[PDB]
């Protein structure tokens, strides 16, 4: 947990951990992580409200979320050390009260925007 | 040390005890009557000295100092990235050994390090004043170091490349075995070591420690800025005009980074202090732009942007900067549009091209030059450096100072059509690091052309069938760019029978207005969730808040999801259940609507005040300051 | 190989590194490039003189007889037609050059060594005649003791006939004296010579007349097909030669001479960077050789240690060593393994054990702990043992009053005087230390130049703005003292101070060189800037790292610099640039501390640093932000 960072702009965490999770349809995804992109200046449509967009990458390739992604974390594995960081992951998820408390990497698109 | 020469072109006597030869020389230069006395040989020698001093920008003594025009002018093809001219120069036959030294430097600058090393060896053979010999030895050692580092990097790192043949690598390793750069100067003829002592520093591993340590004067808070800038210009001119390869090493790049960054930060600090005192600085030019592009990584540019208000930095010589950018675009096209990609040259040049196109946001670009830059960035920029999202970020940054013209819109439409055509394969997918994809380019096009309709994308949708689903769902995110008939053709390919289909359509943009059946779908989902009580809930709460639903029956689902109740009935919500982190998720539109609700605005104001007072969070503070929620 | 051969290799490589290696290249190396051996010329002369076709004396006699009989023109023509042939340069010429010899003496008339030097990018002033000695354009000589054909392929330009050898000392006095001086003052390696060679034995006869232990035994690279007989080796090694036998070096044929030469040349070259340490005793001996000179200094900056070991290991400011460029044996890892395992320590010798104990004390007091892999909870207290730092003005005055029991006490007294404003007394004490005194002598030269600079700046301010600021014309320094200091220091160049030192000092105290200029502040300064950026970047984006602080490196480097400058009593502690560096480091630390607090505590050292190195405006800016 020495590489864990708390990004407060979007109250999430950056941690190099993959996740094994079971969705609401019993589907199994392995070695999946999340990438958050904080885009407040993003060109927003009528029904778009969220400030940051999250992508899911399983086995090095992203996934298209065509269904409700209600999921529960079954296992969390750290890359630098194979130690299971699950319980800490659940603790942080409970504390944060935000979607996807832990993210593989956060991409800040505010400073690279022309309007910044 | 008999005299000290200012970086602004003036001399001051110090440590000189005998005759004031510098003052006498300046007096002689000022008046030709006193010059007429000198003998013929002395007259020619004075003329040569005057040429040298004017060329090197030494004007007069401190007392004579007046309107000093200190304009930088680096006469080097390598500095301006005139790669075609450098190649032409290398192709042509070299008349002398000085042209061979220039050729070797240009070959080093073009990534042709083997040819440059061989040319340096030839110059060393044929050059034994000995100044070119010493400089060639220095540059050959530098190029050997560069080759070694490049070999190490390529061994460590996307595809396996072997720019230097193992035979050549072994030959250079044997030739440079036990080679000492420290002893190079001491081994030179004593006449050389006397005449050319000033070149000693070129044999040292570090030569910018003095210049770097003099940068602390930019961090003071109590001209230093002009001194630092002129010192940097002096170093650049000396290293480039003299064709020294150490101008490409990490030490010099870091020195330029530090100097430019500290100069900009000092200018920003002066600006803020002046605003605080008077209650309402760094003027960048072509050379500053080139230095920032070449010696700055994208991370360094981002640090500059976040630290300072670079939008307040006026950019000068913008036509020259646009010429630089267009030349970079042409070089990118040559490197990639053709098959002339040099691995060694590309490694170094891609960073400068990326930084130049990133920094171009601050420069007004002519329509034709803007089109050239845009096409080069969109099409011929390698994907291993700019992925789809990064390329979109680069492109959108260019609209800050140049409203998207029709030609640039056509270029973006061409890119979109090519992206769609690439989707015929069921395995090709857009890879983005910023999370931005082709739909983002379409959104930008509609932003600057609201009623713009893409004819070729419309046709591509009008040719789609039930088979190539990839093209189908790709064109769904490009729905606004499609025509009415194309929109109708695409819409038939998705079903909204269940709520999840509605969510997917809304996310992809299939449906933008909630039809009554959509509201009833949301309602049945709410009923099922309520029944099963003993993720989208906040989404529907926001939609009702955002006036995206006029059902007026959602209130039946109040009392289980804090965000939903908070959004449906802000007045009746108990704000002890409010989580301030919610405000960190809403975008500008939702936060502004919350602030303007005229209800619950005081609750959010007090929560934000508590957050700012207890955590000093800049995000909460900026939320409160911008929308005053 | 044999122990004596390895000792010869070590001595040769040490000389090559020190720039005191001279190569005496004979005719064998030239013949290695197929150059015509002299016996061919002698046989041609014999065939011309008599019907048809040599002893050592015949070598000189037959050319002499042919000269006297057939004319200088005939002798010269034979030489020209036989020698006016271009030949390639051997890989052994390039090996000799790659050994980095200070000088290359040679008895060859060819330009093969000249061509190799020209190709390898080595500038040697070629001395082949008497006039060339005074006209030498460089300080490194390519000395052709027997002449050459650069002037022309004439028999009077080279030493071939017997008369030439008889009158050599009279015809080549300058060249002979130069050769003897180079032999006396350098390490000589003979290659391409037979042990029974005329020139080698003449040189041995000359060496016979020298003092018993006034010269270094030349190294003789013997590359004859068969191993040297023990009797011959005994005879020639007692004559002042240390023989490296190639036949004993490797197995070879009878007529493959290039392989025999290359064996020795490569074995020498590849040993250039070889520490030649395998057992723990040798590793500890090498480490002590590297670290013992530093025992003079009170404290050594960890970032400086990388220069002590020629970038073999990174010495991080947290006390962890890391392999950087030590392709050879890992001696720091071995040393730390010895340190951890007490049982191994006894396995070392008595002297080796004492040296290891001294090294352990040095490393422990300098905060060097272990390698990165073995690093644990590395926490260190920052204590500076200096009276000047803690502002013990009364204590420094009392110490100054006391009597100097050593030159080190004089150094500390001079530093304290500089720190008490008594610059004239401090300068006089520094001059006295220079006279009495060489680490302290060099540091005293540097400190005296710094104090002279401070005196000059103070006088400038007092005379230019001192009257306006104080409302009075203050004269802290008498005009006599100012004139004397100007006279003394006007001829002093700080830049060349380090070079004007015994080469052993420049090898053992390289790290002190940086004290000449602000280069000693370079690395840290650069790091600071980088770290600043990084830290600011984080605070710009609101990220809150967990664990090791990104600014702890800045604090560690800051205290490293403070300890090195104050405990070593260097006037650089008063420099404007050093004050700016300290101020920037502390400002970054305080800003990061505040940022973390909102989501480091100020101590005595932090308070003293802020007070001493911060202006009031800087403190006000810190309070504002
Ligand atoms: N009268 C003669 O001396 C004569 C005449 C013709 C041939 N030869 C034979 O041919 C060879 C000529 O050499 P030398 O007798 O003058 O040696 P030498 O013993 O006179 O010279 C000794 C040194 O020269 C080197 N050397 C000897 N032969 C070499 C070769 N062929 N190539 C490169 N280096 C060599 C060795 O390394 C040795 O250190 C010898 O083997 C000799 O027996 C001798």
Residue numbers in the entry:
A (entry chain E): 11 to 126
B (entry chain B): 336 to 463, 467 to 495, 501 to 565, 579 to 636, 644 to 897, 911 to 1005
C (entry chain A): 22 to 74, 79 to 462, 468 to 629, 645 to 670
Quote the paper.
The recently identified bacterial Sir2 domain-containing protein, defense-associated sirtuin 2 (DSR2), recognizes the phage tail tube and depletes NAD+ to abort phage propagation, which is counteracted by the phage-encoded DSR anti-defense 1 (DSAD1), but their molecular mechanisms remain unclear. DSR2 contains an N-terminal Sir2 domain that serves as an NADase effector responsible for NAD+ hydrolysis, a C-terminal domain (CTD) that functions as a sensor for detecting invading phages (as discussed later), and a middle domain (MID) that connects the Sir2 effector and the CTD sensor. DSR2 forms a tetramer with its C-terminal sensor domains (CTDs) in two distinct conformations: CTDclosed or CTDopen. Monomeric, rather than oligomeric, tail tube proteins preferentially bind to CTDclosed and activate Sir2 for NAD+ hydrolysis.
